[PDB]
Design a protein around this ligand. Structure first.
Ligand SMILES: Nc1ncnc2c1ncn2[C@@H]1O[C@H](COP(=O)(O)OP(=O)(O)OP(=O)(O)O)[C@@H](O)[C@H]1O
Ligand SMILES: Nc1ncnc2c1ncn2[C@@H]1O[C@H](COP(=O)(O)OP(=O)(O)OP(=O)(O)O)[C@@H](O)[C@H]1O
Ligand SMILES: N[C@@H](CCCCNC(=O)OCc1ccccc1Br)C(=O)O
Ligand SMILES: N[C@@H](CCCCNC(=O)OCc1ccccc1Br)C(=O)O
Ligand SMILES: [Mg+2]
Ligand SMILES: [Mg+2]
Ligand SMILES: [Mg+2]
Ligand SMILES: [Mg+2]
Ligand SMILES: [Mg+2]
Ligand SMILES: [Mg+2]
Lengths: 267, 267
C-alpha cells in the first residue's frame, strides 16, 4: 500500500514533532490517520482542561514582562498606517519590500514593520522623558510573501529600541543575549545588510533568522527627526515559537483557524 | 483675553480628567499651556519610572486572565480575513455595516468583528472538546466610522462565547455581571436589535454601549455550520477604558501616536 500525496499531506497536518511515526512503513492510511487523530484530540483536550493560553498570546505576555521589568515602555501603536510611511522609510517604489506591502484604500497600508511608529515615539518621548529613552512594541505586521516554511503574510513582531546614552553595539548584543537566554534559545550574530537600515546584526538560530538589529545613527534618521544615537532590534514571534516547539512549518505558530498551539483544528 | 478655537483645542489636548482648571478664567493661554505641559510631563515621567504598561495591553492581559481562569480557551485568529465572510455574515451589500468595511486587495478585508472566526472555531472545536465549548478572543477590529467621541476606526474587541449546555440568557447575563464586576464598571442591560444577529442584549453604562450580546440559536447559524445552542458577547476595550478613566474622547484610549495612556505625546 503506497500513500498518495493527498494522504501524506493529511498525515503531516496531524503529525506533531514529538511523535515518532513512520508514514510509509506499510501501515494503511486509515490506521495512521486514526492514530494521529486520537493523539491530537487528546492533546487539545489536555490544553482545554489545564492551560488554555494561546502560544502567541502567552509569548507576547512573557516578552512584555521581560522588557517592562528592564525599563522599557510598552507601546501599542496603529497597525493601519499612512502609505506615506513606506516611501519615507526608504522602501523605494521599485520592488523588493515595496511589492510586499498590503495597501488599504488609497492612502493607507498595513504596517510591514514596527519601526516607523517607534521612531515617532522615540522623537516625541525625548521631549519629556529622561535619557535614555527605552521603548518596545509587540504586534501584528503584514507582508506579501512567496510563502515558504519560514514566512507568514500575517506575523507578529517584537521591536525594542533605545535612544540616547548606552546605544552601543555591545549593549545591543547584551540585551539580545539576555532576551534569548531568557527564552532558552541558542543563537549567533552574523553581519547582513538591508535596504532600509544598511548594515544589520542578524540574530541566527542555525540558518533561521530570528532578528535583524541595527546600531544607529543612520542617514534615515533625519527624515524621522531622530538626532541622537539609538539601537534597536526586530524579532518574529512565530519564528521564536517555531524554534521553541520544533515545528517544521511556521504556519503551526501563526494566527490561524487551522492550528491551535500547533495542533490541527481539522479533527 | 479670549482664547481662540485653536488655543482651546490645544489646552483640551493637554487637559486630563483629574485636573480642575478653568480654561476661560482670564488667565492667558501661555500660562495655562505651560501649567498643563508641566503636569503632563510629570505624569509621563511617573509612568516611565514606575508602571510602564500600556493601558490597552494591560487591560487585554487582565481580561485574558479572567476568561482563561473561568474555563475559556484563548484564541488569536486572523485580522486580515476573506471578504467572503462579510456577505456570509448577513451584512447585506447595501450599506450600514457594509460601507464600513476596510477592503484589502480584491478578496480580503480587515475584520470588523471577531464573530466569524470564533464561529469557525466553535464548529471545529466541537469535534474534539467536551461540552460546553468556551472560547474568547481579544484583538484589533476595523470599521469606517463618522468618528465621534465613542468610535474609533481601529479598535480592540473582546468576544467571548459558549456553545452547548449552559447557553441561556441567565448564564450570559451572569458572565457579563461577573466580568464587569471584576472591572468595577456599573451597567444595565437594555434590549436592542442589529442586522447581523437580530435581538441583542446591549450592556449600557449610561448612554454608552459597552457590548452587544446574543442568545442563539439564530438563522445565521446554518451558514456557519453551528447546530447547537450558543451565547456570546462583544465588548470594546477602548470604551471600557473610557469609562474607567473618565476620558471625554475615546481617542485617549486608542492605539495612537498622539496619546500614551491618555497623556498627550505632543509635549
Ligand atoms: N513574512 C514574515 N513572517 C514571519 N516572520 C517575519 C517575516 N518577515 C520578517 N519576520 C521576522 O521579523 C524580523 C525582522 O524583520 P526583517 O525585515 O529583518 O525580516 P527579513 O530580513 O525580511 O527576514 P527574511 O530575510 O527571513 O525575509 C525577522 O528577523 C523575522 O524574525
Ligand atoms: N468603531 C468602534 N469603536 C470603538 N468600539 C466599537 C466600535 N464599534 C463597536 N465597538 C465596540 O464593540 C462592541 C460590539 O460591536 P457592535 O457591532 O455591537 O457595535 P455597534 O452596535 O455598531 O456599536 P455602536 O452602536 O456604538 O456603533 C460595541 O458594543 C462597542 O463596545
Ligand atoms: N529588525 C528591525 C530593526 C528596526 C530598528 C528600528 N527601530 C527604531 O527604534 O527606529 C529608529 C529609526 C530612527 C530614524 C529613522 C528611522 C528609524 Br526606523 C526591522 O528592520 O524591522
Ligand atoms: N457583540 C458581538 C456579538 C457576537 C456574538 C457571536 N459570537 C459567536 O460565538 O458566533 C456565533 C455564530 C454562530 C453562527 C453563525 C454566526 C455566528 Br457570528 C458582535 O455583534 O460583534
Ligand atoms: Mg523578508
Ligand atoms: Mg533577512
Ligand atoms: Mg532581517
Ligand atoms: Mg456601529
Ligand atoms: Mg449599537
Ligand atoms: Mg451593538
Amino acid at each position: 500500500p503506497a500513500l498518495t500525496k493527498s494522504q501524506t499531506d493529511r498525515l503531516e497536518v496531524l503529525l506533531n514533532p514529538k511523535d515518532e511515526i513512520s508514514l510509509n512503513s506499510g501501515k494503511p492510511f486509515r490506521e495512521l490517520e486514526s492514530e494521529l487523530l486520537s493523539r491530537r484530540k487528546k492533546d487539545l483536550q489536555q490544553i482545554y482542561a489545564e492551560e488554555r493560553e494561546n502560544y502567541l498570546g502567552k509569548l507576547e505576555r512573557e516578552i512584555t514582562r521581560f522588557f517592562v521589568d528592564r525599563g522599557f515602555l510598552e507601546i501599542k501603536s496603529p497597525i493601519l498606517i499612512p502609505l506615506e510611511y513606506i516611501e519615507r522609510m526608504g522602501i523605494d517604489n521599485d520592488t523588493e519590500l515595496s511589492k510586499q506591502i498590503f495597501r488599504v484604500d488609497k492612502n493607507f497600508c498595513l504596517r510591514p514593520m514596527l519601526a516607523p511608529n517607534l521612531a515617532n515615539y522615540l522623537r516625541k518621548l525625548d521631549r519629556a522623558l529622561p535619557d535614555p529613552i527605552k521603548i518596545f512594541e509587540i504586534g501584528p505586521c503584514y507582508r506579501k510573501e512567496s510563502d515558504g516554511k519560514e514566512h507568514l503574510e500575517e506575523f507578529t513582531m517584537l521591536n525594542f529600541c533605545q535612544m540616547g546614552s548606552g546605544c552601543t553595539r555591545e549593549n545591543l548584543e547584551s540585551i539580545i543575549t539576555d532576551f534569548l537566554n531568557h527564552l532558552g534559545i541558542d543563537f549567533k550574530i552574523v553581519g547582513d545588510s538591508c535596504m532600509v537600515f544598511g548594515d544589520t546584526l542578524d540574530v541566527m538560530h542555525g540558518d533561521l533568522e530570528l532578528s535583524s538589529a541595527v546600531v544607529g545613527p543612520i542617514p534615515l534618521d533625519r527624515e524621522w527627526g531622530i538626532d541622537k544615537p539609538w539601537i534597536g532590534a526586530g524579532f518574529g514571534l512565530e519564528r521564536l515559537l517555531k524554534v521553541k516547539h520544533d515545528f517544521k512549518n511556521i504556519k503551526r505558530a501563526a494566527r490561524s483557524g487551522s492550528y491551535y498551539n500547533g495542533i490541527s483544528t481539522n479533527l
